[PDB]
Specification:
The protein is mainly α. 53% of the residues lie in helices and 0% in strands. The protein has a single domain, classed as Orthogonal Bundle (Lysozyme). One of its GO terms (molecular function) is carbohydrate binding.
Length: 158
């Protein structure tokens, strides 16, 4: 279906339309021409399953991009400065805005998509065999591999 303008990135079929709108808004905030939306779609698929994959997880309450309470707290002032309003955890749009701010930070700071993803999953000090607060194995390398491949499969250009 032809768009005005022609550059409009097409939603992957498997990405729910509510999620697409969240990630497009985030993409707009970072001027990424729709490419970041594709990356964010891949991340959200892995983290939650667009919200469907959280039931029974001990970190279910962390929402769509699985930002831990202490991390959300650390980034409150920066979120407000970037987006113009206080972070509201009950808002799925905000959850995505917060996660995407953190992910953008990692990508910019470490200099690549792959490192952004690895560090988004494991933090800045990840090692093989590392463990999160709940005692779950953090497979940061596999995460980066999976999510990057998914981003590419979605038609990511970088």
């Amino acid at each position: 279906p032809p768009t005005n303008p022609p550059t409009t990135v097409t939603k992957p079929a498997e990405v729910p339309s509510r999620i697409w709108t969240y990630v497009m808004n985030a993409d707009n905030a970072y001027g990424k021409g729709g490419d970041f939306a594709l990356l964010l779609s891949a991340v959200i698929k892995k983290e939650s399953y667009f919200g469907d994959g959280l039931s029974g997880s001990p970190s279910a309450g962390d929402g769509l991009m699985q930002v831990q309470p202490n991390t959300r707290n650390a980034y409150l002032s920066q979120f407000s400065a970037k987006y113009g309003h206080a972070y509201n955890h009950s808002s799925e749009q905000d959850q995505v805005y917060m996660g995407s701010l953190i992910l953008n930070e990692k990508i910019v700071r470490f200099g690549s998509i792959y490192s952004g993803l690895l560090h988004y999953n494991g933090g800045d000090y990840w090692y093989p065999g590392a463990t999160d607060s709940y005692g779950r194995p953090i497979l940061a390398d596999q995460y980066a591999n999976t999510v990057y491949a998914q981003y590419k499969s979605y038609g990511g250009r970088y």
